[PDB]
């Protein structure tokens, strides 16, 4: 699909848009009961969008995607994984501000 | 309805077995991706079971029951709420050992 930011809909959708992505990906594990996700989520989303295809953001609602949180050993939300060619290359938990997200994205993109 | 320990199945099951409970209730909010819930869960279930109906334990899987987590402002798991006559009277987050769980239940029960 056209957008660099998207909700993961299922396991195949994850395999295709994350594992098989040809660009680096930020996977944002969140949930509707997690207050801090409501700050982080839109923040990162906007900054990912500004990169115009150099990075993509897969949003994963943990409640709809329990398997995925198990596979990635997510124990709290928000968790954001940086992924490349199918593997995890960086991670953080909790909120980060704009400068920190910018640094996180530059480290991933180059 | 003979067990003092039970999984909450839906909204009405919650209003009936927790809000409308005649006994003190320990509500355990857990998920399959949360490691520490696998220590706490069985430990607390066993200790509640030993009380033979002076308290009950309502288990709430947060992924099957997002709504309850939103209502009770659960921000992380494990979160355990103590409830009586439909109100929240105590709370803790994370694992506790048997001495702590034992004090917690004596404070609740009396």
UniProtKB/Swiss-Prot annotation, chains A, B:
It is found in: Mitochondrion. The record marks 35-36 as: Contributes to redox potential value. It comes from the Eukaryota. The record marks 28 as: Deprotonates C-terminal active site Cys. Belongs to the thioredoxin family. It is linked to Combined oxidative phosphorylation deficiency 29: An autosomal recessive, infantile-onset, neurodegenerative disorder characterized by decreased activities of mitochondrial respiratory complexes I and III, severe cerebellar atrophy, epilepsy, dystonia, optic atrophy, and peripheral neuropathy. Important for the control of mitochondrial reactive oxygen species homeostasis, apoptosis regulation and cell viability Is involved in various redox reactions including the reduction of protein disulfide bonds, through the reversible oxidation of its active center dithiol to a disulfide. This is Thioredoxin, mitochondrial. It comes from Homo sapiens. The gene is TXN2. The chain holds residues 60 to 166 of 166 of the full protein.
